[PDB]
Design a protein around this ligand. Structure first.
Ligand SMILES: OC[C@H]1O[C@H](O[C@H]2[C@H](O)[C@@H](O)[C@@H](O)O[C@@H]2CO)[C@H](O)[C@@H](O)[C@@H]1O
Length: 496
């Protein structure tokens, strides 16, 4: 599906993807390059499993917190803007997408959750979470409720959990300590206990989700919701008379939203990196590109200084920014998805009554500390199943140092092997690889989507079943069942 000459773009379903697709059409009009914007379910979960397959996007949009994990797994291409372009965006938005000294994406916009409230039902929103049980009593008498927001995603409940001292990873001396997790300390427990009590006393329901909360507020059934800038569009349509303001305090301390930077990363496996850079820098990251997206669904405070000086007059933006300053910029470290999943499970189990607050958070604490497992990155000397198309044939990835010069010339448009002989590793996925087939000795250039890692257990399973009835592939599989240790790759290149 991904192929040279075209762009496939993924962005989340709550973002202004029709607006983004209008920028895509402008790009297609001027350049002839087709742009397809998609918004699949669970895209932040899917990207790592399909980035190296034919089903990956060239460009992925998400909050920066997922991008450290992607980069550690080699899925993101390094971004290389000159000083002039960097000067166009705020420094702190670049740092959000800096990973191990490298720029790993283009920042787009800054997102924080705010308290949104119906100015008709409630001209004086509570400054404190504590006021809300009594406020809901009063509103229940009038056929309404005080507050509804998405309880299925920890993003929305984290500000309350963090208010009295909950945190993700301890930050000191400019680095995150991954073994110091603040998920089950007395503060986090206090905040999640408050949430569960709101449920128990019937002021909120445990299965309220994004669209339930959205419909409810937009129809005037609830005085308040908690949401981001992307949601202001549908409230405008509603003609609910609404304000956007600072989240309530908990035990006198501000709610502390995790702040996100919507960012666009480029798939390291993509053959369209230069096109992707042209689209992002020259079409999206301009006043008119960003405006088209923002008029579909508000971006928040954009990273682009020129367009932001316009947007910054909006009091809804100022409120976002105030909440952002009371919260934390999310870490981009690879441990973040394990943290999010751990806390997601904890909140859903506690709110539903399926587990206590103490036991839910204690399990989340240990889970959030699990060692991060990066996706493997195709390396030279790796043993693969390679498709000439052409049927899949066992082969070895050849390092550039060993590639016969004639074969180099046909290339598409350190691992220490020996004290003197070292192979530069692949830092990321590549758009093309030079492999050499076993018991065949021919070379080919392949895309990653046409390679699959081949283990020895893979070989046996093949050499044990009905697949062995295909005789021509037996010596191939049985050379590769040896593993890369059992093959002198210098010999294999030199003499077959
Ligand atoms: O709830 C966990 C989730 O939080 C954040 O996801 C946000 C995203 O940043 C926003 O742009 C918006 O779309 O809502 C999402 C939550 O529904 C993290 O970015 C994400 O990694 C995390 O899993």
């Amino acid at each position: 599906k991904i192929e040279e000459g075209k762009l496939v773009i993924w962005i989340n379903g709550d973002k202004g993807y029709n607006g983004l697709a209008e920028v895509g059409k402008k790009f297609e009009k001027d350049t002839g390059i087709k742009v397809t914007v998609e918004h699949p379910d669970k895209l932040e979960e899917k990207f790592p499993q399909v980035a190296a397959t034919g089903d990956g996007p060239d460009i992925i949009f998400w909050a920066h917190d997922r991008f450290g994990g992607y980069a550690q797994s080699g899925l993101l291409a390094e971004i290389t803007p000159d000083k002039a372009f960097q000067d166009k965006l705020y420094p702190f938005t670049w740092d959000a997408v800096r990973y191990n000294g490298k720029l790993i994406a283009y920042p787009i916009a800054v997102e924080a959750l705010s308290l949104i409230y119906n100015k008709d039902l409630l001209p004086n929103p509570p400054k404190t979470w504590e006021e809300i049980p009594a406020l809901d009593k009063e509103l229940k008498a009038k056929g309404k409720s005080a507050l509804m927001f998405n309880l299925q995603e920890p993003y929305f409940t984290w500000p309350l959990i963090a208010a009295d001292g909950g945190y993700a990873f301890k930050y000191e001396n400019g680095k995150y300590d991954i073994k110091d997790v603040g998920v089950d300390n007395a503060g986090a427990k206090a905040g999640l206990t408050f949430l569960v009590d709101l449920i128990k006393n019937k002021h909120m329901n445990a299965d309220t989700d994004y669209s339930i909360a959205e419909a409810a507020f937009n129809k005037g059934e609830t005085a308040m919701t908690i949401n981001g800038p992307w949601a202001w569009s549908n409230i405008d349509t509603s003609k609910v008379n609404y304000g956007v303001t600072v989240l309530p305090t908990f035990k006198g301390q501000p709610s502390k939203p995790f702040v996100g930077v919507l960012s666009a990363g480029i798939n390291a496996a993509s053959p369209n990196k230069e096109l992707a850079k042209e689209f992002l820098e020259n079409y999206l990251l301009t006043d008119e590109g960003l405006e088209a997206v923002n008029k579909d669904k508000p971006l928040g405070a954009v990273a682009l200084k020129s367009y932001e000086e316009e947007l910054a007059k909006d009091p809804r933006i100022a409120a976002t920014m105030e909440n952002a300053q009371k919260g934390e910029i999310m870490p981009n470290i690879p441990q973040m998805s394990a943290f999010w999943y751990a806390v997601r499970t904890a909140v859903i189990n506690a709110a539903s009554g399926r587990q206590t607050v103490d036991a839910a958070l204690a399990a989340a604490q240990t889970n959030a500390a699990a060692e991060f497992m990066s996706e493997a990155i195709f390396q030279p000397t790796d043993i693969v199943l390679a498709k000439v198309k052409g049927s899949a044939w066992p082969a070895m990835i050849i390092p550039n140092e060993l590639i016969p010069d004639n074969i180099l010339k046909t290339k598409p448009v350190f691992i220490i092997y020996t004290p003197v002989l070292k192979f530069r590793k692949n830092d990321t996925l590549k758009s093309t690889y030079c492999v050499k087939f076993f018991c065949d000795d021919s070379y080919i250039w392949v895309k990653p989507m046409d390679m699959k890692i081949l283990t020895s257990e893979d070989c046996r399973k093949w050499l044990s079943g009905k697949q062995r009835k295909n005789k021509k592939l037996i010596p191939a599989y049985e050379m590769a069942m040896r593993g890369k240790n059992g093959i002198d790759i210098w010999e294999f290149v030199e003499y077959g």
